[PDB]
Design a protein around this ligand. Structure first.
Ligand code: CDL
Ligand code: PC1
Ligand code: LMT
Ligand code: LMT
Ligand code: LMT
Ligand code: LMT
Ligand code: LMT
Ligand code: LMT
Ligand code: LMT
Ligand code: LMT
Lengths: 494, 80, 75, 558, 188, 37, 73, 87
């Protein structure tokens, strides 16, 4: 069997073991948690084995298994240098997601672990499948377990929040389905190798673009459309919020390198000015309203909207630099947003039971270790050099500017306004007076669990910010096949 | 995937779900014979689906050749 | 906007309108066989009118869309 | 074989008056339907668009036999509901082959198993279903107008009788009355349509009408306007029988009033026969040549019905609080997808039509079994909610409100996920089977120019998903209002079960509490086989979809 | 093209759409629960028939008018008549927001119905071999460079062979400046 | 012919009452916030 | 879930948050709200889009030297 | 022309009926007598015996619906005590 199926089967084996141990024993919930965490370690172990054996400049799909037994819907699993790092991020994030929420679930612990083990399978799949109809199948199988992850383990406004993400993500995904169905009917299949050969007529590509973009604007999400995220990324449990922002948000970032860039190039080129206008607006309106947010977890959720706009504008630049910067900023947001939900929804909400920023002040005086990590995370969210977030923004903004110079200049306002929301939140909670008077008793500082998941996540952000070539070497050759263009003395050689 | 493998497992999955819906214990020793019976029925149904597959393949093959005569022979008569 | 026109012109507007719409339509369903029979004949006449006068398809949608709005309005 | 079965069963039930003798007559109705499956299975060794039999008044087709067997198996699964007691008592001391085959268990089974329950006492219930099945498998194979009329009445009249068979319920008799009075008017429409066919063509044979339509379809004294006008009246009656809007107000009321056992059968079987019959009629009334004939195509009524059924079925269901009324409206939104695939007559739409009908008949069946099993499960539970106290026919429909399902995840977690997997299939979420059905219907419509209807369909699918999620939120997002019965576990309350042997000597005595009472195996196994088919279709799709591709290859062949 | 009398056609919609709504008021009176009488169809439910008449007359007239004004026949006019129809729909409820909301909801449907093609009747048949049409669009993998340039245009990173010499011409014609870049090397 | 509890429009108004959706006017709510003084 | 530490929850601030979370239920269409809802959603993005349309491929700085022109069109 | 008029009478029995579930029983049979009567008069015109036979089988199904219809109406009356529709 292929080694890419081993990534899928392990979480499946782990769900089986959680449901069949109580039959060998009133077993403790501690042993439920250990099995799920070990089984996400193994996926990470395997995924690094896949990465050692990867070939950084091969234009054929790798780790493929020859099926030669065709059906109507067959799983085809290939790994490519444009998808490898999305897989690695998934497998590094899911253990922290489990450890972060280790004592906070308290009830329905089996069901909680079985959903996350299910989620890791489906999100691993969406990066590994070699069809665009297969891509859609897994891109939307994550929807039922997320409706239940929010309504069982979510906060007060959990019911409306779970309806919002499900219904918005269902609606937006059904316009992508109509366009995928058109592509398949014209071409006969949705297997990548046969689609990338095929070139659609301009008018068809103009109508496939309207349909793949409706979906991804719903799933970025852009400003006019993000009302599900400000509910779902907040009412959800801590572990739900980590997966939703780090991994689920990137399903459409990686889905533009497959669905738009190679098969609808003329449409992408001629409509970019519409994308850039939308992207510029969500860099401003989201930045303006991230200043006035009184919910700490909601402030982090709103930050993701402004970040996602920068990478969306990068993936539409037709430049090798904005394309790699978009993947780097997708990865960068993955580690940093994870840490700030760990700070907001998993530490202050553990100790105070509230998310209102009015009750917090001067937390440096009694939690110095929280303050140190909270400040480093806050500076990466502000796009400060030495973090992977700065590199992703620099390259994303450069390509946005080289393609359409006016929108990149309005996108670069982020540099100013991301810094203004990030420092203002940090100053209000850690600094900004003395330990607040609403704290009747003292609050303990970080536990050894809270320290080491923040430390792990922060370490990824810095070392990748110093040596981004750890991720750039795989991207260069594979990214070099989604650029559309020619130069006069370099093309059509004889 | 292998049909005999999928269907054998499908029968083992059907036993696990039935005990879960009944809330009866999975794996009590004096009832473990159910898993072999459910798996054997899953093996047998699948040997029947392999015979179904074999015949359908012949039929779809013939038809794709017939549509390739109708399109051909019509083009032959349009050459006049 | 965020807590306003975006939600009034969207999920909260659609929620408020549709629930009122469906309460009105289900106010038609009265379990009176006498009223059900008239509804079937009414639905029969419209089919005959549609597919015998060769009416413009657009003429139908105007009726259908105009009907939905009257169910949005109460009293 | 269905006819030999009705006559033999009729003679046996005619000379008995014993009500304890009903469970066994339902078991023989399952064995009887198994011989019919062995006969139609062996009648599938030929290729033909059709063979007229019995003087041309009947026809046999590969699509006709497949549907005959599908009808017989869907019938064998509903029959299990009346052939096995709802609950069973199981102990690991009596669980091996030697025990279940050579040993025996003796205890007071009457109040545990509901031996004298209502659904276990009607003796003619296995017979009435067998007369409905007969009308269904005749309608599939009708080659003449009179045969159509006589078959549709055989099926319709037996549905009315099934809906009135709980004679001591004010609800059931009310529903049978609504069904007969609105069903009789539908039959006038079907009779008017056929009469106007023969009176203008001189023929009652469908093939002659197909040829008169074939010769007319060419791009003066006798325009064939009657065919499209006759078939539009004709389809109005069949639209009512399948409850497509606008003629749908009857189904929510009848499906909620009659007992849930009964609504499994009545809400499935009539659509399977009516929709298969219409497909052959749509194929041979097609206008290949764009002429004035295609402007009055009768298929437009199905296009307007499908459009209206998509809207009505998904909008009106938002405010339902009764589960059976909810499921009635959900079926109307599913016939809006079946009706669009039928209206676009293409090779892709017919293959998508065939898949949608079979898988939806299979999944809505799971939705009916899960509901009936949850009703039987609450026997060991009690509740103090004041609203449940005032419900009517609490024995014929145990679950009536969606609020009675609050916190079922806490009572039975996998039964709740079976109801989740089935409802998410109605929504059309991947990787579930019901996704792959709506995918095919949308692709068929888009490929052939029905872009406007596709956008309407995906919009209403969002709206219809709202009331499906309300059911899911109710079962999982809250804590139950149902508590375990305190007496069943009282420590002093135990029922003695005796293990005997072949020569009736005690092997063991055992003390059992309410913790030793479970769901019966026929119900648990049936639920798990269908929940698994919905969840694992992406790994087992070749034989099911290939059967449809071959079937439409013949109907369109030559 | 052939001009059409807008006023005539506009009345036809009023009678066609209004005629149906008159049948709806007939249903309302027949299902009245009191002894309201036959003439109640024109007194109690008259506003039901009037709004159908108003909407029908606005649509067909305004569309036929817009057809004459633009001297074209296409999906666009089914839009203009649609907006003026929903505009009349909201005039009855007396709320300004509903006037815009109904018009948006009404007009977007009618344009979408027409541009997508007439679905509710017989869809137009091209009467051509579908196997040839589908197979051509699957194996039409390369195109003449000139064909793509028309839709996207040379520039924006699409610099086809000879772009610089052409750009020289384009700039000279517009700015009026001869292009002569500096050697940037002191020898040769 | 069916009981009012089952088809009646009333229990929809009890399960989905119109009061779920505020409709305060310019007098009782100028800030559009809920009557927040 | 877990019991948190004691917080002097302020009756005033709790209802302020409860005001914000429920704020959208009271939004109305007035002449004031339409004006803001029209400028932010339509005018400002339409204005940005127009500049994005008119300057597309207008300028390139790549390799351009003295004697050459930044304008590409 | 008599056949169509008598069909209208059955239709109009459904138009004017708010309370009589018995007249709904009656008008269905007036509608059946129209359609059978139309089939018969066209059979005389075409010298066909199949139209006569088709009438016979309509008459036999028509009587059977009366038995099922009056039987179900009896089952309803036993628990109701009234055939009336409150309105
Ligand atoms: C696409 C689909 C592809 C499917 C592929 C295969 C998937 C797996 C299918 C496995 C089917 C197993 C069937 C046998 C079974 O239930 O085994 C457990 C069965 C019951 O064990 P249990 O579940 O622990 O219940 C304990 C008590 O028996 C107490 O039990 P109870 O009294 O509640 O009822 C006992 C029995 C009632 O039925 C019978 O008595 C069986 C009569 C067969 C003739 O229940 C059943 O057998 C239900 C079977 C339903 C199958 C069809 C569902 C659709 O074992 C037995 O003792 C039965 C005898 C062995 C099997 C003989 C018949 C085999 C063929 C049956 C065809 C129907
Ligand atoms: C997911 C929902 C599942 C719901 C439960 C039902 C699951 C199965 C769904 C339908 C699958 C197809 C069943 C068709 C009928 C049975 C045919 C079969 O499997 O074997 C044919 C065989 C045919 O046997 P045969 O002896 O006639 O075959 C002679 C020809 N040779 C020897 C070459 C094979 O089994 C039968 O005898 C048919 C009747 C079986 C009894 C009724 C079974 C109902 C099921
Ligand atoms: C497509 C469908 C939707 C996709 C998402 C699927 C989500 C599946 C969730 C996991 C399956 C159900 O998870 C199930 O939860 C119930 C809750 O009563 C647990 O059941 C147990 O809960 C607690 C645990 O301490 C016990 O005290 C209690 O006695 C027992 O009922 C099961 O041990 C667990 O397996
Ligand atoms: C482009 C437009 C957007 C596309 C589609 C977006 C649709 C999202 C709208 C969903 C509306 C919310 O859906 C509905 O919300 C209410 C709460 O408000 C929920 O109601 C629930 O929460 C309330 C909170 O007091 C509780 O009484 C209870 O837990 C429950 O009734 C319903 O269970 C849900 O049906
Ligand atoms: C950035 C733009 C995002 C767009 C997101 C998608 C928009 C979806 C389109 C339809 C949205 C619903 O649009 C909304 O309709 C409902 C009725 O259903 C109206 O809701 C309300 O209308 C009027 C006020 O105008 C009220 O008196 C009435 O009681 C109520 O129904 C809203 O005024 C309208 O804005
Ligand atoms: C969960 C779903 C699992 C799959 C369920 C469906 C599996 C069964 C599908 C069988 C039907 C298609 O498979 C095939 O069809 C054709 C046409 O009907 C038939 O084929 C038959 O006719 C030919 C023609 O004379 C005979 O020579 C042949 O021996 C005979 O088998 C059979 O029926 C079956 O061989
Ligand atoms: C704006 C909202 C989003 C609207 C678009 C959503 C996805 C649209 C997908 C592209 O639009 C799609 O184009 C293809 C090819 O041009 C059409 O498919 C076409 O197939 C046949 C092929 O013979 C054509 O003759 C016919 O014009 C059309 O049906 C689809 O009917 C249309 O849906
Ligand atoms: C809101 C909804 C707005 C419109 C949604 C998409 C509508 C699609 O309907 C549109 O029909 C036209 C004309 O048939 C087709 O558009 C295209 O058709 C053929 C291919 O089929 C092309 O070669 C042709 O250049 C173009 O006209 C497509 O099918 C679709 O683009
Ligand atoms: C385009 C498709 C997408 C848009 C579709 C929108 C459809 C929305 C349907 C909403 C269905 C009902 O959704 C919800 O139902 C619950 C039922 O208690 C109610 O929810 C209510 O709960 C409490 C009482 O318990 C109320 O005080 C509160 O005002 C409200 O949250 C409301 O009635 C509605 O918020
Ligand atoms: C960081 C992103 C940077 C790229 C985006 C901004 C690029 C701006 C480039 C501006 C210069 C482009 O090229 C420039 O065109 C402008 C057009 O008015 C000319 O500007 C000149 O135009 C007229 C003649 O028409 C002169 O009389 C006038 O004094 C001056 O405005 C310059 O002579 C030419 O050099």
């Amino acid at each position: 069997m292929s080694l890419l199926y081993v990534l899928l089967i392990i979480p499946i084996i782990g769900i089986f073991l959680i449901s069949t141990i109580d039959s060998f024993y009133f077993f403790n919930v501690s042993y439920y948690k250990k099995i799920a965490l070990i089984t996400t370690i193994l996926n990470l172990i395997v995924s690094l084995i896949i990465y050692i054996l990867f070939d950084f400049s091969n234009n054929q799909f790798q780790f493929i298994q020859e099926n030669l037994d065709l059906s109507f819907y067959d799983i085809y699993l290939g790994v490519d240098g444009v998808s490898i790092y999305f897989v690695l991020l998934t497998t590094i994030i899911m253990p922290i997601a489990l450890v972060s929420n280790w004592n906070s679930i308290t009830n329905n612990i089996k069901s909680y672990l079985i959903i996350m083990l299910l989620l890791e399978t489906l999100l691993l799949a969406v990066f590994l499948v070699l069809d665009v109809l297969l891509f859609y199948i897994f891109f939307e199988s994550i929807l039922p377990p997320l409706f239940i992850l929010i309504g069982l383990f979510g906060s007060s406004n959990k019911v409306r929040a779970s309806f919002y993400i499900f219904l918005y993500t269902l609606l937006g995904s059904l316009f992508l389905l109509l366009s995928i169905l058109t592509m398949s009917s014209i071409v006969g299949t949705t297997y990548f190798d046969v689609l990338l050969k095929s070139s659609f007529e301009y008018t068809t590509q103009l109508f496939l673009f309207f349909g793949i973009f409706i979906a991804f604007a719903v799933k970025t999400p852009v400003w006019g459309l993000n009302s599900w995220l400000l509910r779902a990324h907040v009412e959800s449990p801590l572990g739900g919020s980590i997966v939703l922002a780090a991994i689920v948000l990137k399903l459409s970032l990686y889905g533009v390198f497959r669905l738009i860039l190679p098969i609808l190039p003329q449409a992408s080129l001629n409509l970019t000015y519409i994308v850039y206008a939308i992207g510029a607006i969500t860099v401003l309106y989201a930045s303006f309203s991230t200043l006035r947010t009184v919910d700490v977890k909601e402030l982090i959720a709103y930050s993701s909207v402004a970040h996602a706009a920068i990478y969306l504008m990068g993936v539409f630049s037709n430049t090798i630099q904005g394309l790699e910067g978009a993947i780097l900023l997708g990865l960068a947001h993955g580690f940093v947003s994870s840490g700030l939900f760990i700070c907001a929804g998993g530490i202050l909400y553990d100790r105070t039971g509230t998310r209102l920023i009015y009750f917090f002040r001067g937390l440096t005086q009694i939690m110095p270790l929280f303050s140190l990590f909270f400040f480093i995370l806050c500076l990466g969210n502000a796009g400060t050099p030495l973090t992977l977030n700065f590199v992703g923004e620099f390259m994303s903004l450069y390509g946005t500017l080289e393609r359409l110079p006016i929108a990149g200049m309005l996108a670069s306002t982020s540099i100013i306004f991301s810094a203004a929301y990030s420092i203002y939140m940090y100053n209000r909670i850690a600094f900004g007076g003395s330990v607040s008077l609403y704290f009747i008793d003292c609050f303990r500082d970080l536990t050894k669990r809270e320290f080491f998941i923040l430390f792990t996540l922060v370490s990824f952000t810095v070392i990748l910010g110093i040596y981004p070539s750890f991720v750039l070497d795989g991207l260069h050759y594979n990214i070099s096949s989604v650029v559309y263009g020619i130069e006069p003395n370099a093309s059509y050689l004889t | 995937v292998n049909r005999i493998l999928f269907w054998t497992g499908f029968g083992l999955a059907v036993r696990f779900w039935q005990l879960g819906i009944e809330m009866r214990p999975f794996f009590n020793r004096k009832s473990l014979w159910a898993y072999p019976l459910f798996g054997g029925v899953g093996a047998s149904f699948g040997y029947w689906l392999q015979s179904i597959d074999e015949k359908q393949t012949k039929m779809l093959e013939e038809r794709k050749q017939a549509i390739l005569e109708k399109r051909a022979r019509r083009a032959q008569r349009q050459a006049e | 906007l965020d807590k306003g026109s975006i939600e009034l012109f969207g999920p909260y507007g659609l929620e408020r309108g549709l629930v009122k719409l469906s309460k009105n339509i289900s106010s038609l369903s009265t379990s009176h066989v006498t009223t059900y029979a008239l509804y079937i004949l009414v639905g029969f006449i419209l089919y005959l009118i549609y597919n015998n006068l060769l009416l413009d398809y657009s003429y139908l949608l105007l009726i259908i869309i105009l009907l939905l709005l009257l169910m949005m309005i109460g009293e | 074989m269905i006819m030999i079965s009705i006559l033999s069963l009729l003679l046996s039930t005619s000379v008995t008056l014993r009500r304890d003798m009903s469970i066994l007559f339902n078991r023989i109705s399952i064995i009887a339907l198994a011989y019919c499956i062995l006969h139609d299975t062996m009648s599938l060794s030929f290729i033909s668009k059709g063979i007229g039999l019995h003087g041309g008044l009947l026809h046999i087709t590969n699509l006709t036999q497949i549907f005959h067997i599908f009808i017989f198996i869907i019938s064998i699964l509903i029959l299990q509901l009346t052939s096995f007691y709802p609950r069973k008592v199981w102990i690991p001391e009596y669980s091996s082959l030697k025990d279940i085959f050579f040993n025996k268990i003796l205890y007071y089974r009457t109040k545990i198993i509901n031996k004298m329950g209502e659904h276990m006492k009607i003796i003619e219930y296995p017979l009435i279903l067998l007369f409905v099945i007969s009308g269904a498998v005749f309608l599939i194979s009708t080659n003449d107008l009179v045969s159509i009329f006589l078959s549709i009445e055989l099926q319709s009249y037996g549905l009315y009788l099934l809906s009135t068979i709980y004679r001591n319920s004010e609800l059931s008799t009310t529903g049978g009355l609504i069904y007969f009075l609105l069903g009789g008017l539908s039959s006038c429409f079907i009779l008017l349509g056929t009469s106007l066919l023969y009176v203008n063509s001189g023929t009652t044979s469908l093939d002659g009408l197909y040829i008169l339509n074939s010769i007319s379809d060419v791009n003066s004294w006798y325009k064939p306007y009657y065919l499209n006008f006759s078939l539009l009246i004709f389809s109005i009656g069949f639209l009512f029988k399948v409850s497509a809007a606008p003629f749908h107000f009857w189904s929510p009321d009848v499906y909620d009033a009659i007992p849930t056992i009964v609504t499994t059968f009545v809400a499935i079987i009539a659509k399977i026969s009516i929709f298969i019959f219409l497909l052959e009629l749509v194929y041979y009334t097609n206008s290949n040549a764009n002429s004035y004939l295609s402007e009055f195509s009768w298929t437009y009524a199905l296009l307007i019905s499908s459009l209206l059924s998509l809207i009505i079925g998904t909008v009106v269901g938002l405010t339902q609080f009764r589960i059976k009324r909810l499921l009635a409206y959900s079926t109307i939104s599913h016939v809006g997808f079946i009706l669009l695939a039928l209206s676009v007559s293409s090779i892709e739409s017919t293959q998508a039509f065939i898949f949608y009908l079979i898988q939806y008949s299979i999944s809505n069946l799971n939705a009916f079994f899960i509901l009936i099993t949850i009703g039987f499960s609450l026997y060991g539970y009690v509740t103090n909610n004041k609203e449940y106290k005032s419900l009517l026919d609490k024995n014929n429909s145990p679950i009536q409100l969606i609020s009675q399902l609050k916190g079922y995840f806490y009572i039975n977690p996998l039964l709740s996920l079976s109801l989740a997997i089935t409802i998410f299939s109605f929504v059309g979420v991947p990787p579930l089977v019901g996704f792959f059905a709506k995918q095919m219907v949308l692709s068929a419509a888009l490929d052939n120019g029905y872009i406007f209807l596709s956008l309407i369909a995906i919009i209403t699918s969002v709206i219809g998903a709202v009331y499906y999620l309300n059911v899911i939120k109710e079962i999982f997002f809250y804590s139950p209002e149902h508590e375990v019965n305190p007496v069943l576990n009282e420590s002093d309350s135990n029922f003695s079960l005796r293990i005997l042997n072949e020569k009736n000597v005690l092997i063991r005595s055992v003390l059992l509490k309410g913790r030793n009472i479970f769901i019966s195996s026929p119900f648990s196994i049936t639920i798990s086989i269908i929940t698994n088919v919905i969840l694992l279709f992406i790994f087992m799709n070749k034989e099911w979809l290939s059967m449809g591709t071959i079937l439409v290859q013949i109907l369109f062949s030559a | 093209y052939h001009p059409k009398d807008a006023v005539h056609l506009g009345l036809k919609g009023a009678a066609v759409v209004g005629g149906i709504g008159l049948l709806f008021a007939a249903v309302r009176t027949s299902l009245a629960r009191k002894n309201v009488g036959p003439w109640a169809i024109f007194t109690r439910n008259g506003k039901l028939a009037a709004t159908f008449a108003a909407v029908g007359g606005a649509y067909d007239f305004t569309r036929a008018a817009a057809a004459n004004l633009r001297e074209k026949e296409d999906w666009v006019n089914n839009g203009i008549g649609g907006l003026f129809a929903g505009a009349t729909m909201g005039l009855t409820t007396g709320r300004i927001p509903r006037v815009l909301g109904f018009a948006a909801l009404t007009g977007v449907v009618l344009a979408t119905a027409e541009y997508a093609g007439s679905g509710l009747r017989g869809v137009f048949k091209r009467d051509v071999d579908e196997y040839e049409r589908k197979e051509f669009l699957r194996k039409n993998r390369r195109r003449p460079i000139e064909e793509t340039l028309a839709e996207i245009g040379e520039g924006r990173g699409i610099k086809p062979p000879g772009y610089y010499e052409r750009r020289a011409q384009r700039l000279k014609e517009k700015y009026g400046v001869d292009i002569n870049p500096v050697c940037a090397d002191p020898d040769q | 012919f069916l009981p009012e509890a089952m088809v009646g429009r009333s229990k929809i108004d009890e399960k989905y009452p119109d009061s779920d959706y505020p409709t305060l006017t310019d007098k009782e709510d100028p800030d559009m916030n809920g009557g927040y003084i | 879930g877990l019991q948190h530490y004691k917080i002097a929850m302020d009756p005033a601030l709790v209802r302020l948050g409860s005001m914000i979370s429920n704020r959208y239920k009271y939004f109305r269409w007035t002449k004031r709200t339409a004006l803001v809802s029209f400028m932010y959603v339509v005018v400002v993005p339409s204005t940005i889009g127009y500049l994005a349309y008119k300057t597309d491929g207008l300028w390139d700085l790549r390799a351009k030297r003295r004697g050459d022109l930044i304008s590409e069109r | 022309n008599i056949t169509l008029i008598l069909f209208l009478i059955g239709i109009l029995g459904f138009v004017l009926n708010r309370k009589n579930i018995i007249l709904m029983l009656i008008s269905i049979e007036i509608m059946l007598l129209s359609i059978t009567f139309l089939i018969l008069l066209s059979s005389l015109n075409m010298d066909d015996i199949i139209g006569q036979t088709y009438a016979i089988y309509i008459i036999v199904v028509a009587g059977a619906e009366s038995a099922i219809g009056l039987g179900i109406l009896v089952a309803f009356y036993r628990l109701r005590g009234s055939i009336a529709i409150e309105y």
